Amino acid sequence: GVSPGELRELTDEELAERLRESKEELFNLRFQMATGQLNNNRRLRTVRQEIARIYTVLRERELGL
Amino acid sequence: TLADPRDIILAPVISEKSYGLLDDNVYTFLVRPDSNKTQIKIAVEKIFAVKVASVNTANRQGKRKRTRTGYGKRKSTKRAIVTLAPGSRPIDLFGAPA
Amino acid sequence: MAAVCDICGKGPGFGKSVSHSHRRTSRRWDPNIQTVHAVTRPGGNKKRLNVCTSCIKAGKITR
RNA sequence: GUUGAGGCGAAUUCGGUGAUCCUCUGCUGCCAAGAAAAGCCUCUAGCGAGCACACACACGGCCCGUACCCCAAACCGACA
RNA sequence: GGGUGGGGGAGUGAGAAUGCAGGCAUGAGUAGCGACAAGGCAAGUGAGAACCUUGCCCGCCGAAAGACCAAGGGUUCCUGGGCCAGGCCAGUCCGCCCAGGGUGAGUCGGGACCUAAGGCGAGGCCGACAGGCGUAGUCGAUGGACAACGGGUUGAUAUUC
RNA sequence: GGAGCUGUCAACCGAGCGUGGAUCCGAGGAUUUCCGAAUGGGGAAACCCAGCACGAGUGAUGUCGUGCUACCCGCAUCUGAAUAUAUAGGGUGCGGGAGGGAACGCGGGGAAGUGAAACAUCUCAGUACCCGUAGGAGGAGAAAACAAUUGUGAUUCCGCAAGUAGUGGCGAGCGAACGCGGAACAGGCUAAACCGCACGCAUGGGUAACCGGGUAGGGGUUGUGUGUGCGGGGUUGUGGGAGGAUAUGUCUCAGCGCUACCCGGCUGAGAGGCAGUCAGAAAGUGUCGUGGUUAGCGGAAGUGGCCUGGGAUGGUCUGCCGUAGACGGUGAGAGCCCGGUACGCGAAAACCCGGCACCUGCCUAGUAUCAAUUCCCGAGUAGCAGCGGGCCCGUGGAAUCCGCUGUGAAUCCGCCGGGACCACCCGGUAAGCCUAAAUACUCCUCGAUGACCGAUAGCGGAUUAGUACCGUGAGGGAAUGGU
Ligand SMILES: [Mg+2]
Ligand SMILES: [Mg+2]
Ligand SMILES: [Mg+2]
Ligand SMILES: [Mg+2]
Ligand SMILES: [Mg+2]
Ligand SMILES: [Mg+2]
Ligand SMILES: [Mg+2]
Ligand SMILES: [Mg+2]
Ligand SMILES: [Mg+2]
Ligand SMILES: [Mg+2]
Ligand SMILES: [Mg+2]
Ligand SMILES: [Mg+2]
Ligand SMILES: [Mg+2]
Ligand SMILES: [Mg+2]
Ligand SMILES: [Mg+2]
Ligand SMILES: [Mg+2]
Ligand SMILES: [Mg+2]
Ligand SMILES: [Mg+2]
Ligand SMILES: [Mg+2]
Ligand SMILES: [Mg+2]
Ligand SMILES: [Mg+2]
Ligand SMILES: [Mg+2]
Ligand SMILES: [Mg+2]
Ligand SMILES: [Mg+2]
Ligand SMILES: [Mg+2]
Ligand SMILES: [Mg+2]
Ligand SMILES: [Mg+2]
Ligand SMILES: [Mg+2]
Ligand SMILES: [Mg+2]
Ligand SMILES: [Mg+2]
Ligand SMILES: [Mg+2]
Ligand SMILES: [Mg+2]
Ligand SMILES: [Mg+2]
Ligand SMILES: [Mg+2]
Ligand SMILES: [Mg+2]
Ligand SMILES: [Mg+2]
Ligand SMILES: [Mg+2]
Ligand SMILES: [Mg+2]
Ligand SMILES: [Mg+2]
Ligand SMILES: [Mg+2]
Ligand SMILES: [Mg+2]
Ligand SMILES: [Mg+2]
Ligand SMILES: [Mg+2]
Ligand SMILES: [Mg+2]
Ligand SMILES: [Mg+2]
Ligand SMILES: [Mg+2]
Ligand SMILES: [Mg+2]
Ligand SMILES: [Mg+2]
Ligand SMILES: [Mg+2]
Ligand SMILES: [Mg+2]
Ligand SMILES: [Mg+2]
Ligand SMILES: [Mg+2]
Ligand SMILES: [Mg+2]
Ligand SMILES: [Mg+2]
Ligand SMILES: [Mg+2]
Ligand SMILES: [Mg+2]
Ligand SMILES: [Zn+2]
Numbered sequence: 001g002v003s004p005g006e007l008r009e010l011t012d013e014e015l016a017e018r019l020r021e022s023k024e025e026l027f028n029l030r031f032q033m034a035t036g037q038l039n040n041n042r043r044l045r046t047v048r049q050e051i052a053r054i055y056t057v058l059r060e061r062e063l064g065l
Numbered sequence: 066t067l068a069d070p071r072d073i074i075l076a077p078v079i080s081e082k083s084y085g086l087l088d089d090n091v092y093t094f095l096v097r098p099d100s101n102k103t104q105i106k107i108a109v110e111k112i113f114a115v116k117v118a119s120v121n122t123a124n125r126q127g128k129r130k131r132t133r134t135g136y137g138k139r140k141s142t143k144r145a146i147v148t149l150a151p152g153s154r155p156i157d158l159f160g161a162p163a
Numbered sequence: 164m165a166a167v168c169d170i171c172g173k174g175p176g177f178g179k180s181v182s183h184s185h186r187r188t189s190r191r192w193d194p195n196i197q198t199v200h201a202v203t204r205p206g207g208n209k210k211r212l213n214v215c216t217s218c219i220k221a222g223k224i225t226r
Numbered sequence: 227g228u229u230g231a232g233g234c235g236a237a238u239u240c241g242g243u244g245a246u247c248c249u250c251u252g253c254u255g256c257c258a259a260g261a262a263a264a265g266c267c268u269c270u271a272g273c274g275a276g277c278a279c280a281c282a283c284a285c286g287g288c289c290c291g292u293a294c295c296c297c298a299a300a301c302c303g304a305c306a
Numbered sequence: 307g308g309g310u311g312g313g314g315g316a317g318u319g320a321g322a323a324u325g326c327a328g329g330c331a332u333g334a335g336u337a338g339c340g341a342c343a344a345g346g347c348a349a350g351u352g353a354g355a356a357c358c359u360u361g362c363c364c365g366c367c368g369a370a371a372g373a374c375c376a377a378g379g380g381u382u383c384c385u386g387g388g389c390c391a392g393g394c395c396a397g398u399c400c401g402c403c404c405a406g407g408g409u410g411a412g413u414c415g416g417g418a419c420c421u422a423a424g425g426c427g428a429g430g431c432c433g434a435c436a437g438g439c440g441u442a443g444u445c446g447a448u449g450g451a452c453a454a455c456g457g458g459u460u461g462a463u464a465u466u467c
Numbered sequence: 468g469g470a471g472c473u474g475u476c477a478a479c480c481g482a483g484c485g486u487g488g489a490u491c492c493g494a495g496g497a498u499u500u501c502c503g504a505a506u507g508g509g510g511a512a513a514c515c516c517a518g519c520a521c522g523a524g525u526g527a528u529g530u531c532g533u534g535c536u537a538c539c540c541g542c543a544u545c546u547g548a549a550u551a552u553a554u555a556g557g558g559u560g561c562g563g564g565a566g567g568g569a570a571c572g573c574g575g576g577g578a579a580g581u582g583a584a585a586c587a588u589c590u591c592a593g594u595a596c597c598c599g600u601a602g603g604a605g606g607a608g609a610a611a612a613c614a615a616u617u618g619u620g621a622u623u624c625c626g627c628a629a630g631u632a633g634u635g636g637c638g639a640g641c642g643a644a645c646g647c648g649g650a651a652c653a654g655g656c657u658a659a660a661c662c663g664c665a666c667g668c669a670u671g672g673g674u675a676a677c678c679g680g681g682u683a684g685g686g687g688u689u690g691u692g693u694g695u696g697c698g699g700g701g702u703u704g705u706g707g708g709a710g711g712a713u714a715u716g717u718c719u720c721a722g723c724g725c726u727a728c729c730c731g732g733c734u735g736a737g738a739g740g741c742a743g744u745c746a747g748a749a750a751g752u753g754u755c756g757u758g759g760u761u762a763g764c765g766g767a768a769g770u771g772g773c774c775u776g777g778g779a780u781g782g783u784c785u786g787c788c789g790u791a792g793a794c795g796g797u798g799a800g801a802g803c804c805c806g807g808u809a810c811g812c813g814a815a816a817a818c819c820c821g822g823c824a825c826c827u828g829c830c831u832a833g834u835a836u837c838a839a840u841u842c843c844c845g846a847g848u849a850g851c852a853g854c855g856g857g858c859c860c861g862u863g864g865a866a867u868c869c870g871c872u873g874u875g876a877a878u879c880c881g882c883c884g885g886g887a888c889c890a891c892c893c894g895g896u897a898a899g900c901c902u903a904a905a906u907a908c909u910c911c912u913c914g915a916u917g918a919c920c921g922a923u924a925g926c927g928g929a930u931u932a933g934u935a936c937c938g939u940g941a942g943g944g945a946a947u948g949g950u
Contacts, residue, residue: 016067027071027112028159034076035160042473042483052498055066059497068523068532080407082460091467093410099500101288103530111524121410121466124290128381133476134931146410146467166434175434176870177576178855185588185861189577191434192855192871208554216872221847264420265451286529289417289515293409293463294383297370299393300401301378304937305340306393307800315918327923418516428538435575436598445509 001050007057019054022047070108073100077158078144087163091148092156098124098143105145116150166193168215170223199224 002018010018026047032038077083078093086093096105102120110117123146127139149156166175176192195216200209201224214224 019067020069023069023071027074030076031159035079035158037160040482046483056497058066063497066532070531082408082462085460086467089467101530103286103288107524107530122289123292123410125293125409126381132931134935144410148467165432173871176855177434178870181855187588190855193434194871195873204553206552210555217847223847261423261449262421263450285527286525287412288529291409291415292411292466294381295379295401296375296377300380300382306401317920317924 001046002053004053004057007053012058012061015054015058019051019058022051022054026051070111073097073105073108074112074145077161079161084161084163086146087158087161089148090153090155091146092158094145094147096122096143096145098141100143100145102145105147109147113156114154115156116153118148118150121146121148165196165213166191167213168194168196168218169212170214170218173215173217200226202226 007015007018026044029038029044029047033041033044073096075095075097078095083093094109100108102122105122106117106120109115109120123144125142125144127141129136129138131137167173173194175194178190178192179187180190181187196213197216197219199212199214199219201212201214202209212224218224
């Protein structure tokens with residue numbers, strides 16, 4: 001998973017693009033799991049956690065980091 | 066904060082009825098139960114870059130099961146049935162050939 | 164009628180009524196509340212209040 | 227015809243009888259004298275520089291219910 | 307986990323309260339097995355068949371014992387399995403148990419439209435407190451307004467596809 | 468903190484993470500659907516439908532995201548209906564409330580069963596219940612008090628006094644105080660007279676004879692008199708203040724008080740002293756703690772022999788520690804096997820407490836003497852009468868205290884109390900406010916304990932427990948532990 005330390009250099013738009021990419025990846029993983037071709041089921045939790053990480057970074061950046 | 070259409074569409078429905086509809090080019094999804102038809106249509110068009118003819122929705126109550134002494138209820142779901150425009154590019158479900 | 168005074172807030176009192184055989188039953192002591200149309204300035208608009216005769220006897224209100 | 231699905235497919239005229247239905251929120255009679263509001267139409271107050279209409283094309287039509295029992299073994303009666 | 311001795315303290319002794327809780331007898335393999343429509347044979351399945359499946363007879367309802375709703379119920383619906391509990395007998399069957407599936411609406415019934423009886427009720431009036439009543443208003447169908455018919459299809463939905 | 472981990476019934480798997488520090492423990496922050504006081508409107512709680520603003524999206528309606536939008540109260544501002552003054556009302560902006568909680572507090576309303584061997588007075592009992600409203604406690608609290616020839620000196624709580632004096636269909640019952648011994652101690656602000664200052668009114672609407680007093684003039688008109696507010700002054704019972712005459716300037720300075728002078732006085736500033744999060748004024752900001760709380764770490768001594776045994780922690784020989792022989796686990800009674808125990812270390816950060824500064828505010832001459840002429844000392848109050856309540860006191864000769872109705876005072880030569888009342892004497896100073904501690908309780912959080920229970924017991928609840936089930940509902944409410 002992407003680390004907060006290496007996340008904290010993207011300014012705002014790179015963070016937003018990363019969040020969009022992560023949401024798309026999570027969507028794809030959900031579909032693959034639904035149709036039964038996903039083997040490593042830990043990927044869903046990993047992607048959910050990195051989405052939460054990006055959201056946390058954005059929010060704390062807004063609220064006087 | 067920023068809303069993504071992929072938050073509305075959860076997963077595709079895989080069953081004999083869904084496979085039958087796939088030949089007719091009609092796709093069944095599980096959607097977030099609070100969504101409405103127009104929002105679903107907009108979201109599908111955005112996600113798959115496709116043209117949508119109409120959206121059909123249905124709410125299904127969860128089944129009740131008993132485990133050792135009492136009853137527990139599964140979650141209720143909402144299904145959206147989406148029919149593409151007459152001549153649109155098919156949606157590639159990525160593992161649902163029917 | 165209207166057992167509470169609008170100015171001093173005086174309310175009813177509770178006690179007993181005692182007969183010849185000394186049977187005691189509950190009753191009330193109500194203040195002598197009278198209707199008054201009170202003006203704030205000379206020639207002003209009148210307002211209806213419920214005040215007690217003690218407040219009337221004192222210069223607490225004016226017609 | 228694995229008795230599932232398939233393929234083909236004629237003639238279809240004239241009478242009788244006849245409503246608890248329709249014309250009929252009508253008609254006739256009677257006294258016991260028989261909802262409201264929206265909707266629709268119209269009047270002006272008002273607004274007003276752009277309008278109203280015809281045709282064609284392309285579109286938007288939301289939320290909940292929809293399974294099954296329902297003079298019953300699935301409802302009310304502790305019970306098929 | 308106990309015995310004995312010197313002391314200390316008790317929720318310290320049950321056979322009866324038409325006592326309470328649990329277990330178990332007697333009645334007894336006894337009564338009953340829930341309408342007066344009625345069942346039979348052949349074949350099948352199976353370890354097991356009066357009751358399940360198929361066929362053919364016979365009988366009963368037919369202003370219902372047929373076909374649709376509303377209220378109510380809530381997965382009882384379909385498919386595939388099951389057979390120690392349940393079904394007043396047995397059961398291979400099931401409204402029972404297990405898994406998966408299944409309910410598609412611009413026009414149907416409702417809301418987003420309207421109001422009745424009635425409910426709540428800004429201010430308000432009344433009432434020691436608690437509170438009572440009620441205006442503006444806002445809810446409230448069993449009523450008003452408002453646009454669809456015929457056919458086909460699934461194991462399971464259809465005026466919805 | 469240091470090697471495993473992905474909670475449990477509750478296993479089976481599957482797939483992964485971890486010394487580049489996982490899981491886990493503590494603190495702070497972020498996220499936080501919908502309902503609920505629920506508050507944009509509606510509603511059968513967890514559902515429905517919006518308005519405005521800003522963004523997103525669409526060919527455009529549709530659609531999405533985020534904020535704000537209840538009512539009432541207070542304050543500040545704009546407007547001033549009928550209607551003129553104006554007010555009601557309305558708009559805008561700021562604050563505040565609402566509801567919940569096991570017990571404890573305070574104020575108000577207030578049963579019956581029962582006892583009286585019946586029963587109404589009485590009791591039960593100011594209990595149960597209800598309403599209002601708090602706080603970590605609350606209420607009370609600083610003498611208009613007791614006492615009695617002496618004196619004590621705010622309040623509260625505990626033990627006595629005492630089942631006493633008394634009271635009572637003198638029945639059943641009920642039941643003080645004085646004073647004594649203790650716990651804990653604490654006292655402070657105001658109103659009023661008077662003097663100034665601002666709004667308002669009468670009068671001279673100029674004869675104010677006032678403008679700091681006076682020493683003489685100056686404008687001679689703004690003085691004079693009261694109400695509303697802000698300052699100063701005042702706070703006492705041996706009465707005290709206000710007002711007068713002898714009697715003086717924490718320290719200084721700028722202004723001003725009509726002018727030249729004495730004495731001033733006022734405002735502002737600087738200089739010093741004091742106090743401070745407090746009842747006596749209210750906040751905030753840094754820094755420092757041998758400070759404390761919220762994770763934790765270390766911590767001595769048997770692999771001893773033999774016997775029995777599945778197994779030693781048992782028996783018997785032995786060795787040792789002990790500031791540690793608490794408790795529990797481990798294949799049977801373990802100080803030396805394990806977690807631990809005695810004892811000792813430990814805090815980024817947050818919070819609590821304390822200290823020091825910043826900061827805040829108060830003090831800027833009045834002390835005494837005399838005068839006894841005047842003013843003030845909390846009003847529809849006290850007192851009195853009627854009807855009640857409560858005090859040991861059940862209306863009695865009934866004081867003291869509280870309520871309603873009526874009548875209705877005075878300011879120290881006043882007024883109130885000392886159990887009808889009167890005279891004398893003694894005490895005190897009502898009708899304004901605040902106040903720590905000693906006292907009450909435990910929903911809850913830690914740490915302990917038991918001549919308490921041990922599964923029909925102990926909580927209803929060791930088990931799916933306020934669950935299953937019963938009831939329309941308010942409510943009622945189980946059973947089931949052990950290889
Ligand atoms: Mg979110
Ligand atoms: Mg359609
Ligand atoms: Mg639908
Ligand atoms: Mg089942
Ligand atoms: Mg009132
Ligand atoms: Mg009584
Ligand atoms: Mg009076
Ligand atoms: Mg249907
Ligand atoms: Mg149907
Ligand atoms: Mg029905
Ligand atoms: Mg039944
Ligand atoms: Mg024995
Ligand atoms: Mg003994
Ligand atoms: Mg006994
Ligand atoms: Mg016995
Ligand atoms: Mg017995
Ligand atoms: Mg017999
Ligand atoms: Mg028989
Ligand atoms: Mg039968
Ligand atoms: Mg046979
Ligand atoms: Mg069936
Ligand atoms: Mg069977
Ligand atoms: Mg049987
Ligand atoms: Mg009402
Ligand atoms: Mg109201
Ligand atoms: Mg109404
Ligand atoms: Mg309605
Ligand atoms: Mg209707
Ligand atoms: Mg059907
Ligand atoms: Mg944590
Ligand atoms: Mg609401
Ligand atoms: Mg509401
Ligand atoms: Mg006016
Ligand atoms: Mg409260
Ligand atoms: Mg009685
Ligand atoms: Mg009696
Ligand atoms: Mg008796
Ligand atoms: Mg508090
Ligand atoms: Mg207090
Ligand atoms: Mg003063
Ligand atoms: Mg004053
Ligand atoms: Mg340790
Ligand atoms: Mg051995
Ligand atoms: Mg042991
Ligand atoms: Mg031990
Ligand atoms: Mg006084
Ligand atoms: Mg009196
Ligand atoms: Mg009395
Ligand atoms: Mg008396
Ligand atoms: Mg009086
Ligand atoms: Mg005397
Ligand atoms: Mg007080
Ligand atoms: Mg105290
Ligand atoms: Mg028990
Ligand atoms: Mg036992
Ligand atoms: Mg029920
Ligand atoms: Zn009054």
